[PDB]
């Protein structure tokens, strides 16, 4: 996570398998491949944090 683009707010889509799924275009800012890479997910716990995550 070398720059701010390597940490971005996404919209949840619940899917029936055991991996995080993301668009191919957004892999460049994350510098992410699919050869075993792992990624982390954080859930905001208040309306303020939720809102600024969605708006910034």
């Amino acid at each position: 996570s070398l720059h701010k683009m390597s940490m971005m707010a996404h919209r949840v889509k619940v899917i029936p398998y055991s991996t995080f799924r993301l668009n191919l275009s957004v892999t460049s800012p994350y510098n992410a491949d699919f050869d075993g890479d792992e990624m982390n997910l954080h859930v905001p716990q208040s309306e303020e944090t939720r809102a600024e995550l969605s708006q910034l």
Partner: protein, 1179 residues
């Protein structure tokens, strides 16, 4: 063939290689080093020193008792038995490794030594020299001094002579190679430790700022002595432009750098001319004399041996010598500390002076720009300490400890007049516990990671682990792959992490010497004309070759060519041990012989004149190949012809990196030996236009290691891809041993249907890869099918998975003992009851029966109890609401892992060394491939499954064939994995024709020939096939590369990595979430994640992450002193800060608990971090 003396072909050399691997095996170095240690090194360790003499003086106040006693204990021969185990009942029986593994014992054998206790008496007459005589009490009586762990398959192991049927009877896999120890039931392997060789003079240029420009140093050491390291350095003061260039030596136990001439005069060389002759061997080399004049001008003030000895003694750091005895002190330092590797005796001052002159000569040659500074990375200058020397030095230290203890006990008992008993003298626990601790934990003492848990994920993984070398980490560049690493360590096999280059792996045919006594070679040299060094005068013998043996300049020779010829002849006929290396540097006029241990060498074919054919030719011919073939076929009646027969008859030779400097090697016989329209598809090769070869490579493909030998067509790949595959094949899932069903390993993974590769190398049938494969031949299509295989994802056929592709068994073993907390506080395996047990786990105990163990066959899920154990406690305590005197037992059960589930495969009940019962429960489950599992080809083309399609949705060819896997085309161009494509083509051809593709690296197999064979079979020559879209049945506009390919299932599965945490256990100290998914931990929100959130500008989210999500603590402070020293009774609503004496100036703040802990730690360290809630200054 028909002609017995016909030259061999490139195909014949594999027979030779087979013979080698018949005699040596894959782990020959481990077993050889351990056998050398047990056979000879133990006895040397025992005999060295280990004569405890205690001279109890008469101490006679009256002459009636003027008798001086002398009690000595000596150790004789040492006996090492077969491995045996004691027992709780005391019965001792033979122990087999597949009992030590199951019962957590140590595959160790007792050591006994013949102790001879002598006693002498003398009449204590003052002035008269004491004469000691025996009292006829020459008692002698082997005594048990400890246990030496035994490496499996060694000469002292039960399995050394076992046949295949015997191995099957003993529950031992015949494919198991040994070379490891069993410590407490764990398989431990000793990684070969790399170090710099001793007794070698190395000259180095120093940096500009330092006043010394060049330093010539030797790390002197003696193998048959105290084994102590004394570093002598010879330094040249002054930069190039400076005028006072004086050479000074750094003697041990001396506080100053003595000028060299003072040392030379101290040793006994007074005249300046003689010193200069000792240093410079040429009268015409006036440059060296000019550079050397300052030293003699410096030491002009001393012109006598006694004067120089006094000068050195004055500098002596001991500072406990009187003025007259300084000479003797200096003498002692020059006799037992200066150049120990030469000799510790006296009367060899000339030899040490000659060696010092040689070092100064080397330093001056480097300073005169006549030679480059010695390369620190040259692999011939390195040594590998294997199990032998490591255990040798460890046991030397530990036995020195034990004998010091013996001497202390004897002195104490004789002073206190108590009786003497050997059993109370020797504490075998010393040796036993020391060896067991050093092998059980990596730390080698009382370095780290010297002993490691043997890797058993895959057969190739174990093979690679058993041949691993580690280099502890100067101004060198050790990570680079040196030129001298050719043929000794794998060019491409090393971890990608911090260990890159430091951790190395042996080549297939590389071996480590175990060391031999150099006395026979010294006698040969003396007999064959080596002039002794004592009567050597350089002026009368200017062009004389200096002969070195193990770094000890033993003399000079005047006809080195004949001496080298006869030494080579002796070594080739077996008279000299083949491990001995002999190098002749013609330009430097030197002859070095090395016989010590740790040298890495490889075998090579010998090439001689062969006047009959008029040109150079290999000594090996078709007759020897025929005999080797006959012996191999008989093994699968004629005279046996083994690798040792080739060695003895002078057909093959052992060459190390040092000797490899002075030879010329032909890459292949058929193309480089004979004197000199070509296929454009073949690769370009150069004839070298030179015919003076001395050796020929047995096969170039033997430069690779165990893991790299699996790669098909490694010469058609980018080297980092080869390195990635070498690292990634150890994570391949296969069958690690055939007896996996009788081993209770912690974790084991097995393929249902291992398949041998369609494209296979010649070197992998010595690695048993076809017998224990670690992958499957999947039908792979390279296509942009659905976009779900982008960025290294893969599309796997769901129908193939349904039918058993890449399916796996997984076994996990949980161990549990009952321990004696006291003399009668034994733990008990049982089914704990909620009525009379404490802290019973929230899981179900219903699956345990009355012995506290689940019975094989029962399905177990996560958090269910599999081993029921309870421990007694003190009764008569009441708390917690439901704690009574009935609760005399605390639960100590073992639940199944939270995420894992399966069927209890097996449970094993036994007793430990202490006699207490313990159990091992092995649970079995099935891993079926799914989205997120990692698979890789043999070319570093790793990737996870993106999605799985059923057969009807996959693209299909005109024959109805659908791929098992679809990989993206974009993985090919950037990575340049051409070998992947070539191997797919070759596999298609082999599957069609029924043969096996020979994917060896340096063969003359071209894509043109494979394409022609494929065309003959009726397919497009380049592997393309017209495919049809699964969804619509229409032809795809593009044709698809399609064919079988060998893929490995890697150990990284998504179900072992998925982890989420809303709220859970908190760390006791910081009140923050615990670490790790095994503990339901939380994810680290590191510093730079905080930085990214700052850059985004989301302050509230950062606060929420750091406070509400981790640890929010409300604390009270007072407005007078900002400290948290406020007593707050919330129920009574009373706040008060003692000291300030206030009760209404209180505030509450929400700060991280880590912050409160930090402030309290500051206060405990006498700092007042006062916190104030209002500003006292303007911004």
């Amino acid at each position: 063939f028909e002609d017995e003396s016909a030259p061999i072909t490139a195909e014949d050399s594999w027979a030779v290689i087979s013979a080698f691997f018949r005699e040596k095996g894959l782990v020959s170095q481990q077993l050889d080093s351990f056998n050398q240690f047990v056979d000879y090194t133990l006895q040397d360790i025992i005999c060295e020193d280990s004569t405890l003499i205690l001279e109890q003086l008469a101490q006679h106040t009256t002459e009636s008792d003027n008798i001086s006693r002398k009690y000595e204990i000596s150790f004789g021969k040492i006996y090492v038995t077969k491995p045996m185990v004691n027992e709780s009942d005391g019965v001792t029986h033979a122990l087999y490794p597949q009992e030590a593994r199951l019962r957590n014992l140590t595959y160790s054998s007792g050591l006994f030594v013949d102790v001879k206790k002598r006693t002498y008496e003398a009449i204590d007459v003052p002035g008269r020299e004491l004469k000691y005589e025996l009292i006829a009490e020459e008692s002698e009586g082997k005594v048990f001094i400890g246990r030496l762990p035994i490496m499996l398959r060694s000469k002292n192991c039960y399995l050394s002579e076992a046949t295949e049927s015997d191995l099957y009877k003993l529950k031992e896999c015949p494919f198991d190679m040994g070379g490891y120890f069993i410590i407490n039931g764990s398989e431990k392997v000793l990684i070969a430790q790399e170090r710099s060789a001793g007794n070698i003079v190395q000259v180095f240029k120093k940096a500009a700022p330092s006043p010394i420009s060049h330093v010539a140093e030797i790390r002197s050491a003696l193998e048959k002595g105290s084994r102590f390291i004394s570093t002598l350095q010879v330094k040249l003061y002054g930069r190039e432009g400076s005028s006072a260039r004086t050479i000074k030596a750094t003697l041990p136990y001396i506080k100053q750098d003595i000028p060299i001439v003072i040392i030379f005069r101290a040793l006994g060389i007074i005249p300046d001319g003689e010193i200069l002759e000792h240093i410079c061997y040429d009268v015409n080399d006036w440059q060296m004399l000019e550079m050397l004049k300052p030293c003699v001008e410096d030491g002009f003030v001393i012109q006598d041996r006694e004067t120089a000895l006094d000068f050195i003694g004055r500098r002596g750091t001991a500072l406990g010598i009187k003025k007259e005895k300084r000479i003797q002190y200096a003498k002692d330092i020059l006799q037992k500390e200066f150049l120990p590797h030469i000799t510790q005796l006296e009367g060899f001052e000339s030899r040490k002076a000659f060696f010092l002159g040689y070092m100064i000569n080397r330093l001056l040659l480097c300073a005169l720009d006549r030679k480059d500074q010695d390369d620190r990375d040259h692999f011939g200058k390195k040594r590998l300490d294997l199990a032998g020397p490591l255990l040798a030095q460890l046991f030397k230290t530990l036995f020195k400890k034990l004998t010091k203890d013996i001497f202390r006990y004897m002195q104490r008992t004789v002073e206190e007049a108590h009786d003497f008993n050997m059993k109370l003298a020797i504490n075998a626990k010393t040796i036993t516990s020391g060896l067991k601790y050093a092998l059980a934990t990596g730390n080698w003492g009382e370095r780290a990671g010297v002993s490691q848990v043997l890797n058993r994920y895959t057969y190739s993984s174990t093979l690679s682990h058993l041949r691993r070398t580690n280099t502890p980490i100067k101004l060198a560049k050790p990570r680079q792959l040196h030129n001298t690493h050719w043929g000794l360590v794998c060019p491409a096999e090393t971890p990608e992490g911090q260990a890159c280059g430091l951790v190395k792996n042996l080549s297939l045919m590389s071996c480590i010497s175990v060391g031999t006594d150099p006395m026979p070679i010294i006698t040969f040299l003396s007999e064959w004309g080596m002039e002794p060094l004592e009567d050597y005068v350089p002026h009368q013998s200017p062009d004389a070759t200096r002969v070195f043996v193990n770094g000890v300049w033993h003399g000079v020779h005047r006809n080195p060519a004949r001496l080298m010829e006869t030494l080579r002849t002796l070594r080739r006929k077996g008279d000299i041990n083949p491990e001995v290396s002999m190098i002749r540097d013609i330009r430097e006029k030197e002859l070095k012989i090395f016989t010590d241990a740790g040298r890495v060498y490889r075998p090579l074919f010998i090439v001689e004149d062969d006047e009959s054919l008029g040109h150079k030719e290999l000594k090996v011919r078709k007759g020897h190949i025929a005999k080797l073939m006959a012996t191999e076929y008989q093994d699968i009646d004629v005279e046996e012809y083994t690798w040792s027969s080739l060695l003895n008859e002078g057909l093959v030779e052992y060459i190390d990196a040092e000797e490899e400097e002075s030879i010329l090697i032909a890459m292949q016989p058929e193309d480089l030996e004979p004197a000199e329209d070509v296929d454009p598809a073949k690769r370009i090769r150069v004839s070298h236009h030179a015919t003076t070869f001395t050796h020929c490579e047995i096969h170039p493909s033997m430069i690779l290691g165990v893991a790299a030998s699996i790669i098909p067509f490694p010469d058609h790949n980018q080297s980092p891809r080869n390195t990635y595959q070498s690292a990634m094949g150890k994570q391949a899932m296969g069958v690690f041993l055939t007896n996996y069903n009788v081993r209770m390993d912690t974790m084991a993974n097995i393929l249902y249907y291992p398949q041998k590769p369609l494209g296979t190398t010649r070197a992998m049938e010595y690695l048993k890869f076809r017998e224990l494969p670690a992958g499957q031949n999947a039908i792979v299509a390279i296509a942009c099918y659905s976009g779900y295989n982008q960025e290294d994802s893969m599309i796997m056929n769901q129908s193939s998975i349904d039918r058993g592709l890449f399916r796996s068994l997984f076994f996990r073993s949980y161990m549990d003992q009952e321990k004696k907390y006291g003399m009668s506080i034994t733990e008990t395996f049982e089914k704990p009851q909620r009525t009379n047990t404490l802290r019973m786990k929230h899981g179900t105990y219903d699956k345990l029966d009355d012995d506290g163990l689940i019975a094989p066959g029962v399905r177990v899920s996560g958090e269910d109890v599999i081993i029921g154990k309870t421990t007694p406690i003190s009764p008569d305590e009441e708390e917690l609401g439901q704690r009574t005197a009935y609760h005399s037992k605390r639960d100590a059960s073992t639940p199944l892992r939270s995420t894992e589930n399966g069927i209890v495969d097996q449970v094993l009940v036994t007793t430990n060394q202490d006699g207490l019962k313990f159990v091992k429960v092995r649970v079995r489950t099935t891993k079926i491939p799914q989205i997120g599992d990692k698979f890789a080809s043999r070319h570093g083309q790793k990737g996870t499954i993106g999605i799985t399609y059923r057969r009807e949705d996959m693209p299909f060819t005109a024959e109805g064939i659908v791929p098992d896997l679809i990989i993206n085309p974009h993985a090919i161009p950037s990575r340049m994995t051409v070998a992947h494509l070539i191997e797919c083509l070759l596999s298609k051809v082999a599957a069609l024709s029924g043969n096996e593709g020979d994917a060896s690296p340096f063969t003359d197999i071209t894509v043109e020939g494979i394409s022609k064979l494929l065309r003959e079979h009726g397919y497009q020559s380049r592997g393309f096939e017209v495919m049809y879209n699964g969804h619509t049945g229409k032809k795809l506009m593009a044709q698809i590369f399609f064919g079988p390919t060998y893929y490995q299932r890697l150990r990284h599965m998504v179900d072992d990595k998925i982890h989420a945490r809303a709220r859970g256990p908190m760390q006791v100290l910081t009140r923050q979430p615990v670490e790790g998914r095994s503990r339901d931990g939380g994810l680290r929100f590191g510093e730079m994640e905080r930085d990214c959130m700052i850059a985004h500008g989301a302050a509230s989210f950062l606060k929420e992450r750091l406070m509400e999500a981790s640890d929010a603590f409300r604390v009270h402070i007072c407005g007078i002193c900002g400290l948290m020293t406020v007593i707050a009774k919330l129920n009574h609503n009373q706040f008060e800060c003692k000291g300030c004496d206030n009760k209404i100036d209180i505030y509450q703040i929400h700060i991280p608990y880590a912050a409160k802990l930090l402030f309290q730690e500051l206060m405990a360290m006498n700092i007042t971090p006062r916190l104030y809630t209002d500003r006292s200054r303007d911004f």
